[PDB]
């Protein structure tokens, strides 16, 4: 039996570009998270407590899906290498701005999943295909979730009265279509 | 054992500066309690039922409050000295300027406390600052409540609608962020 | 009414060191978070999965002290300035060595708080030593904890049989004196 | 409609290399099966209990991965062919090496797996490899269990008393980090 970089019991060596690859992703998931906590403090900087309340939540479920990234490489006797975290962006001119960020945040983080992807294809690694498949469909599922509420916030047009609607809605738990 | 000056038996003395700024901040707690009855008011003339029954609620607490400080100085042996009570403010020329002064009030109600702690510090009272510690942390919660509940309605900028949603959220006890 | 820093309705303004002592700790408090998942990884490499299910969640609460925190400058008005998160330490040549890094790491933290605290007095800012000491009373606690993990595994000597012995009491949750 | 080799009604042809291949991997699976259970007699010869217990459910599942591949064929409207089977290794002379064939047989039977999936692509046969899908995705957990249970008797280090203590986690259903 072979050890993997790791230390563990090695069932199938991995690439290392690929292996690189997920470390950089996981990375990506935890500036996602620290994205997602920046956004809750501006909206309760803002008596959006209801948007406070939605993105203190995705905070902590980007962190979850960054350790769940970090248990493969373990499952695989590969190495983690947690990575410095960029400071997130902390100021927007409006909440139709700061939900086209999340939007398009969350578009970058299947675009690297996809990015992921294609290299364990290139390699015929078929457990890392595998792996990021159900991570693809609940990506496909949040990026349903923030085009409903960007584009239910653009509906709003600035206005503040739709916008406290809005902020209810999702203190409620009413955050997608759905 | 000795006698303290409501004749119980004394554990240690306190400074007459010190039972003195207590004594005025009996009639602080009070003032805001009175204060919040006619902040009631002005609301349920004008059919904002939710702020009625907020401000109706804030009214009892904050003579709860009060009570809370008559109770500390019979225990400290010391007389109670309950005052004559200044009439309230009793007209707003908007929901937003009323809820200004609730803001204000909290802040100057926590720095009456802050007072207060500061004397005792001065006479090394530690009995004080401990009684009073808890009371400080329930005012940062005050504050940050006041601030979210000023904020939003600043936030609907006037508009009838906006502040008939916040009615409804009061109403439902949606009060804070929280 | 003032306006504070983060735009809310300001109940006393904070001193500008302070505000950065705050804001570093926050990340300091961040660092304790990511450096206990790197910790996690290192016991998960090695099978130790009653130490890797201790510091998993040993991450998650640190990041929960962090975030709220946060909460606090949001009551307080001022602005939150989330940082550059360094890298974590992974990599040790024991799993005694590890909890030495983790109990110098609780020590450190208590360090930061009790830096915050003396700044918080000289500005005579009861709100944020009212605020602080409770975090300490559990810094206490966290410390105690610590000292017991460290020194009943260097009691273990390196004896790999008293390790997993241990190793099953964090996984059944026995994880203080206590 | 067609009719299939097996004389059900036909979906759609599948390459006969493609189906050789996967009637070979239920001979796989089959001798996993057999392997534990000799696994399994090896460990209660010991009196190691827990080992024992683990090998014989380990057996039986092995048997109903077997069987579910046998129904997939008939979905598939594709003639079985159960294959003579080897007789299983029984000899070992160690715990630590027992566990080393363990891992290295869910190693194989992944590779085996594998090659099947890629097969089933050169061939576009788009069912065989949502079929496979996850029965991959069980393996990495399985990959992952039979790493972290042969790195905790390889960190035993030959001691009876730590065997007995790993025994004893198996006997509880303790067999993951997880
Ligand atoms: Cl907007
Ligand atoms: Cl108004
Ligand atoms: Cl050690
Ligand atoms: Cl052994
Ligand atoms: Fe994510
Ligand atoms: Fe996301
Ligand atoms: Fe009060
Ligand atoms: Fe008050
Ligand atoms: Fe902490
Ligand atoms: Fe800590
Ligand atoms: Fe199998
Ligand atoms: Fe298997
Ligand atoms: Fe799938």
Redesign the interface.
Known sequence: ?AQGP????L??SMNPDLLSAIQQHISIERYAS?TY??MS?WC????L?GF?QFF?GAA?DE?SHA?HF???L????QS?????????R?NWDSLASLMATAFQMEADTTSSIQSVYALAERN?D??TT??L?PLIEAQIQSEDQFAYLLGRVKFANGD??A???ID?EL?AGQTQRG
Do not use: C, H, M, W
């Open positions: 039996v790791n230390g563990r019991a069932a199938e620290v906590l920046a403090i309760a900087e803002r008596e407590a406070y203190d902590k962190q350790v970090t248990q493969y373990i499952a695989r006797s983690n290498d947690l990575q410095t975290l960029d400071a997130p902390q015929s078929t457990r595998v792996f498949d503040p009265t916008l406290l609607v209810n203190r």
